[PDB]
Amino acid sequence: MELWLVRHGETLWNREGRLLGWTDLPLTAEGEAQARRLKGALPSLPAFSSDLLRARRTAELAGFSPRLYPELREIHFGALEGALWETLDPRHKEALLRFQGFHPPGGESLSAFQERVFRFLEGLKAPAVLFTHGGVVRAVLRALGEDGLVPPGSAVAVDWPRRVLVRLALD
Fold it and tell me: Could you tell me which residues are beta bridge partners of residue 47?
């Protein structure tokens, strides 16, 4: 199934290097610019989006009117929300880097995050554009055997659950 996953535009915590999960931060001016550039670069397909502000706003500026689904939200970092990556406990750092055995206090384990994301994708019956988050795009890319890091406001098209089709980054 052809699916286009879009990483929302940047927020302040991108430059600050802080774990950004369910903390509802707004897009930065440049983040909105990245979103506007996506308009015309994404296929005209039904759209779905994380209900968090930064995702909804990206979808809007990109020219879409998505159906909102919490299932497309970034992973819930719990007590780790806002934590500087730099000073993150080695155990949490490694769990996130290797993408496994991650369980933040008061938040979502990586396992639950994946189950939530994949169950949503499996429910999609036709091609669509999904405005979501870095962690969601990463989970999908890793599950397809690839490096899951993509720039803010960029997109990746995949033939779910078989392969990555294209990665699109605009300057």
Answer: 129
How far is residue 107 CA from its own chain's centroid? 17
Q: How far apart are CA 84 and CA 89, in angstroms?
A: 10
Is 106 labeled as ligand-binding?
A: no
The verdict on whether residue 84 carries a ligand-binding annotation is no
Which domains are present in the chain? Answer: 1-171 (3.40.50.1240)
* Residue 92 among the catalytic residues: no
Per-residue CA distances from 44 to 38, 58, 62, 153 (Å): 12, 15, 11, 17
Residue 171 to residues 7, 11, 47, 134, 159, Cα–Cα distance (Å): 15, 17, 23, 18, 25
User: 165 labelled as ligand-binding?
Assistant: no
Which residue reads 């990206």 in tokens?
A: 58
